[PDB]
From a paper:
[name] is a large 3144 amino acid protein organized into N- and C-terminal globular domains of HEAT ([name], elongation factor 3, protein phosphatase 2a, and yeast kinase TOR1) repeats. [name] has been hypothesized to serve as a scaffold for protein-protein and protein-RNA interactions. [name] forms an extensive interaction interface with [name] which confers structural stability to [name]. We have identified and characterized macrocyclic peptide binders targeting [name].
Informed by our crude mapping macrocycle binding sites, we determined the structures of [name]-[name] bound to macrocycles [name], [name], and [name] (Complex1), and of [name]-[name] bound to HHD3, [name] and [name] (Complex2). These were resolved to 2.1 Å and 2.3 Å respectively. The structures revealed that macrocycles [name] and [name] bind exclusively to [name], while [name] and HHD3 bind at the interface of the [name]-[name] complex, this is consistent with the SPR, FP, and HDX data. [name] binds a pocket in the [name] N-terminal domain. The pocket has strongly negative electrostatic potential, while [name] is positively charged. [name] binds a pocket that is also strongly negatively charged like the [name]-binding pocket, though the residues forming this pocket are primarily in the N-HEAT domain. As inferred from the HDX-MS data, HHD3 and [name] bind to the same pocket, which is at the [name]-[name] interface. This pocket is positively charged at the [name] interface and negatively charged at the [name] interface, and both [name] and HHD3 have a positively charged surface docking into the [name] interface. Notably, although [name] and HHD3 bind the same pocket, HHD3 consistently showed stronger performance in pulldown assays.
Numbering used by the authors:
A (entry chain C), C (entry chain D): 2 to 18
B (entry chain A): 2274 to 2330, 2353 to 2478, 2497 to 2525
D (entry chain A): 254 to 329, 349 to 406, 664 to 970, 983 to 1053, 1064 to 1109, 1125 to 1164, 1228 to 1331, 1353 to 1377, ...
E (entry chain E): 2, 4 to 17
F (entry chain B): 83 to 216, 256 to 371
Write the structure that this text describes.
Amino acid sequence: YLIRSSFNWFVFVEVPC
Amino acid sequence: SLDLQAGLDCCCLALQLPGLWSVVSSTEFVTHACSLIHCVHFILEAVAVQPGEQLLSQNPKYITAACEMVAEMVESLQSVLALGHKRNSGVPAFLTPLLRNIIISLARLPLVNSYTRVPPLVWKLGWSPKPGGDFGTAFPEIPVEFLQEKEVFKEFIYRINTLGWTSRTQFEETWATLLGVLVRTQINVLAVQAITSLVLSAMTVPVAGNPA
Amino acid sequence: XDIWCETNKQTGILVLC
Amino acid sequence: LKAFIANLKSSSPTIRRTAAGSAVSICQHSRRTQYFYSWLLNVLLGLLVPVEDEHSTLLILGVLLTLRYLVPLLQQVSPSAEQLVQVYELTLHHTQHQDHNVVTGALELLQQLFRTPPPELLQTLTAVGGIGQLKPCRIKGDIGQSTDDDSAPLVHCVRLLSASFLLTGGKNVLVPDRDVRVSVKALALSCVGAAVALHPESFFSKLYKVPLDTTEYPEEQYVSDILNYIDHGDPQVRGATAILCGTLICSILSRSRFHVGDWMGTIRTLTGNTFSLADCIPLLRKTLKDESSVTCKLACTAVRNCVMSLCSSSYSELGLQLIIDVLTLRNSSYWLVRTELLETLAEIDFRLVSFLEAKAENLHRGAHHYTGLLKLQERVLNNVVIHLLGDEDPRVRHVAAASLIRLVPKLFYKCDQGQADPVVAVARDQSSVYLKLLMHETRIYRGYNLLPSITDVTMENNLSRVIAAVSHELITSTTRALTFGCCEALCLLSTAFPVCIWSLGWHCGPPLCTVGMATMILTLLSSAWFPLDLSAHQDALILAGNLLAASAPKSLRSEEVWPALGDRALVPMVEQLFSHLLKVINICAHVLDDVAPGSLGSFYHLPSYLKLHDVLKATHANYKVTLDLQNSTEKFGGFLRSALDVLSQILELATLQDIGKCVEEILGYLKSCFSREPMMATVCVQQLLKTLFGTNLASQFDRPGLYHYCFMAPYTHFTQALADASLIHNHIRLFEPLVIKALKQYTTTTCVQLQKQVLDLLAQLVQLRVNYCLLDSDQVFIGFVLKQFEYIEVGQFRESEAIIPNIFFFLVLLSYERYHSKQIIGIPKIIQLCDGIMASGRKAVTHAIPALQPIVHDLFVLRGKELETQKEVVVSMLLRLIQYHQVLEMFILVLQQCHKENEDKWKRLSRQIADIILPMLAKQQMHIDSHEALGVLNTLFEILAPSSLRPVDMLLRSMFVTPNTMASVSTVQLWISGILAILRVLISQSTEDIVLSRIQELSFSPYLISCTVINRLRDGDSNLPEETFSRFLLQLVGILLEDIVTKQLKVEMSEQQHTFYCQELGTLLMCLIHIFKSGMFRRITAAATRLFRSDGCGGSFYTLDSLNLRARSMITTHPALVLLWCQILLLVNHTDYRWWAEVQQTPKGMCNREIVRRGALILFCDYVCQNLHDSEHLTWLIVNHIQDLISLSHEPPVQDFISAVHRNSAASGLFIQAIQSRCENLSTPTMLKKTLQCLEGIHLSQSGAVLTLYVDRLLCTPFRVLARMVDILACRRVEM
Amino acid sequence: YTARYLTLGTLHYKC
Amino acid sequence: GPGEALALTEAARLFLRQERDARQRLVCPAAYGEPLQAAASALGAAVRLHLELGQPAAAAALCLELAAALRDLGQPAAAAGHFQRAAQLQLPQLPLAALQALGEAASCQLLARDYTGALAVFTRMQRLAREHGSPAALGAFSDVLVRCEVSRVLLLLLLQPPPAKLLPEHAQTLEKYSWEAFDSHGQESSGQLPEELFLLLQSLVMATHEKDTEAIKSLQVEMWPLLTAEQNHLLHLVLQETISPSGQGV
């Protein structure tokens, strides 16, 4: 999936699926 | 919204450049100039004017329609296209400066400019000369006896300040017109302000006398 | 006009109790 | 009368006008008004009735004019139908006269005959053979005759008017204006409109009944060619043609019950007319754009007549098109066009407009492909109604303020807690009247309220938005006119929606009950110009007093100035208003005394108040030299009245340390103001006594939806009610001159409102313990009041209805103890006055009942053998009037008081009342043809001792009765009302086996109201017990349905009668639902289930299919009653798709059809949840109604149906297959959301099927919030 | 032209 | 006192009509604003006078008249300042009037391209509307909350504040339109907004999380009928800053 980046509220990052 | 902006940015910029202007300001392009006027009026009403409201408070009939549409749009610059005015609240602020600049530039086309310079109150007073030129739309300049009417003179001043002048000939004709009002204190004050605005309009840098 | 006038009778006085 | 009839032959039009007016006026103010109208009508027709004799043209004009002034007084011995048809026939004769001044007088008379038809003439002119059952002439063929049997007289009348004045007989030709003058053409077009209002099919006639010669006339001409007068040169003729269109559109939509295609199809087969109802709308549209303002005013009146019926019809888009096209008239130069637009817009229901706007797509685009919405409510509210509060004409501002008040109840807004959509908003409106329950059960000034008000949230929200908008325009006001119009609007809003009741609507924030914008209104009355407009100023004072009164029960305490104010932020506002009031009342005191200006009321040193003195001095100077004594708009009196009223209001917040330094100054002002406004000055003296004596408030303090509104809330309120059915003063000498002035004024005046107030003052003075025998020196005033009864009894005292209750309250007080020198009056004498006014006078409900109400409240609540004797005499007076519901309310009181004092007296009196009431009900002698009266009777039957009703025989013998006739609505309503009153007793105070055994032992027949009995009673020609009872109720349903559907809307019944039929049917159907749904009436339920399946025993009884044909006709007009019928059909297991596919509009607009469509599906879902052992109705809902189930999935019964589908594998499979065959209509954001909320719980054995639907159809959308929800649900199904 | 009424008789008008 | 104040309102409106003739009715190129300078000095003395007379609502009326004039005359930054001075003078006594004035200041900051300033005025309004108008609001304050919600979400999608400037109120507002966890649907509506507008805002806030520009372009044409023209300008700026970011010099 995507998840929210922790360093910026508007940035999202992928996690393995 | 990016596509309305792309088409209207192109129309705005193409009419600002003298080499593109002189193509559309020509007899060969009359049907193209009429399309620009029809399309801009149509886009403006489709965005700004709700059903049951109005925008304000021989030659083919499309030519006469173009003159009326540009005259109504040049009137709308006080009201519907005045940025942040109480009647602009139906137009999104990104369309307003484009539509202003386009309308001022379309009103300078030879096709419509003579018609658009006439204060609408003089048609109501019943003036009706036979036009004659390249397009069948070249009216005379307004008789100075109408410019003794305070409202007709304010409405004339609005149109000459808004459109500017398209040639040395037109500057000299509006100069001769305004001098003819000096030869009541209120029309002297209006003519002193109008002649000041006219001569100062020569000081505009890239192209003198073109407000757009 | 009134009946006190018209029958020549004096009007009353108010007092508590 | 003979002295004025003699002048009807005069050459002078003026002498004839004086004679005609004087003659009818003398009759109108006589004692025997109906006898003198009949005598005058004898004389007037006597002057012309030998019609073969040539009469004087002057006399014809004088008599036609006198009849024209008389016919509005006949609208209601008495005038007969035969005499009234002679007026009509004589009018038709004089339209063919040579002199067209007589034709004008006859058409003007005919216009009053159709504008205000006398009821016997109205029945005659609309009936199918109604009269037959008892320069030169232009008519060139057979137009029928007035006496024909094949058609109603109005068909002939419209032909005559058309052929005389409008149509030549040749198609599309207008009659020349030299052949008939345009004044006569306008009168003739408007007489046709007034006839079409009564009988629409008169418009569809071929002009000639037998053709003219086919050589000169090759095509037949229709009457509908009069719509060619829309293009005529004269403005009044064009406008009269637009008025004809509006009346024609409205009347077709009322005479057809919005079933236009059926009604038009019948008329097209009878006449051959290709004409359409839609053909009128472009004629209204072109005439709103007329060059003449008079034509434009008339086209606006035409839209006001038809816009709402268009919006309710299958032509509802043309309704929106007309609302759009009138908005341009806001910019009109003519003030009468502006006010007609404001009156037009005030008729519109914006809930219905919001429904229509939501269904519209292409209509939002107009002629020019517009982007965005119509926003009609926002444009009407802001750009017309609130915009015209700024109008320079005060007449337009006044109309705009009134139109705004009519709009607040009709506004719709999204996200409201009471109504999530406009179909729910229209449904709750339509249910609110017909499903109203049958129920019943030191004075503070206006604008105060101590009890918790239980307000409607939707109305508080609508009011909040309106007050915010009008307050914004008041803040940003750049013009004096807009400031004035916003103050008038807020003042009137604060009257129509009182601030102390609607405190959340009036909440701007300041006290965190409310004070709204009080500081904003107080800024105006300190400003230099606003006080000098007396109208805007009196509106500011009234609004300021109302806003400061509405704080009270949260601003009251228990500092040294204004001690009762605990909210000390309000004390500046109150001191500002109070000192202002004393200054402006002192200005009036100076102006009324003529004393030149030169301490709180002192103003001689303030320039703003000296300007106000000179405005008021000028307004009073014009009054001194004029005599318009009825004029209510006189601005000095109006201003002074409002000042004294607002002072009287603010004195509820005052106590003796506020007023004690100040009272002698206020009484000095009131002494000067008293001669100009005696009544409001007396009210101020009463409040000023309540402040001195500690008797005022300052000294005497300490989610819903369609299932809910159409069924569940009415039902729950009804079932709960049936369950409950089984259970320092030295200052007094300052007031003496003003009290003596009030006493004197009572003995000189004829103003009953002054006299009523002086009695209220004396009643308050005896309660405040003033010595009456020193105030009334020798019983002079009481002697004068007793002398007034002689004139009141004989009917010589004009407005005595207003004075009676205050005299009886004053006499009742003055009787107490043996106080003062002697007892002034006794209860025995008060009983003799009351039996005097009861004996032989005018109507009880205005005279004897208002006299009883004080005496009954004293002797049974507040006041021993002499007393008990007088109480028994009052009960014998009440039993003489028991037919009136106001004395049943007095019987509820005496029963509630004897139930507490002595149970054996309560049992005896309850038997005595029931033994009188039940015979009266059996004979229709009770005045119960009203919702309030039926509710009072229902309450009396709960308050009677239950031993009074114990053997049900007397109830049954009073219920199982026929009326003397069914030819009149009043008789049918009284009869059904008595049955509904008794049926409620049987189903709440008795049990099925008690009632059914007593029915069998009394041998009642089901044939008591068979169709043969009903049919003869409509002409006026006077075996189980469960089957007997069920037939009786199921026959009454058919009677009510027939009378609601068939009876013509204004001809045969009043508007009050039409709603009471619907309320009777709502009450009846709610009883049948309690019988079949409670389980407490199991034998009656089984019998009704058998009866609904039967043939009519041949022709003897109404069948289910005949009851359904009437109920199906009600869909377009009474959707709340049709939904109760749907509920009964499911309770008797009638599940035939010949009903359900019609009401649910099953595939193979009108708002009332949508209410029934949704309500029917919801009710059917509530049924199948109780029938899950049956597969067919589960499958049928899914296969045919999947979209509607998903749209309605928030309604509790449809939610339960969807949860039942989730528990069944095959049903969940059909649900997925049905979504898969409609997913293209589900693709809209709100519908896809609802679809996925349904699919989330789908059965475990269908997980591959629903997953296949997700990836194939639902996963690929621009709506990212929904594509994420599909992804999550799809992942859960692979995990499953 | 000829008319007929109930309370009035049968009457004639000059076309 | 009140007569002197009245005369100053008329004497200010004289210069202000004179300015409107030169600027708006004649469109004079030589119209340097000597009458506007005289009108602003005249009302400066009159506001001082109404506040010494202790009647803030009558001073706020002058501030609204001058603010409206400066907006019409093409100076929205000067208008936004005078609208906030009117709001501050109204707020202790007339909360709805103050919200109306702050709404016009926010429109003026948007005309002046001062989007971070507009964002802060909408947050002040949404606080004051909950504080005086209440979790359901009364109908007049509810229409203000609905404006502030939609405007703040589009302003936050335009500006995208760092964690240092994502205030608790901004984070709390945005999370209603966002997902907390990988299997969350996103939150359900509290009934503040129409369901269709709420679903389109959630879709927009989610399309900017997953960088779906084709979805943002589709949602822009779909939301056009539902928004005010001011909000359609905000949503245009979100799609414009998405495709052609500011601050790169290109």
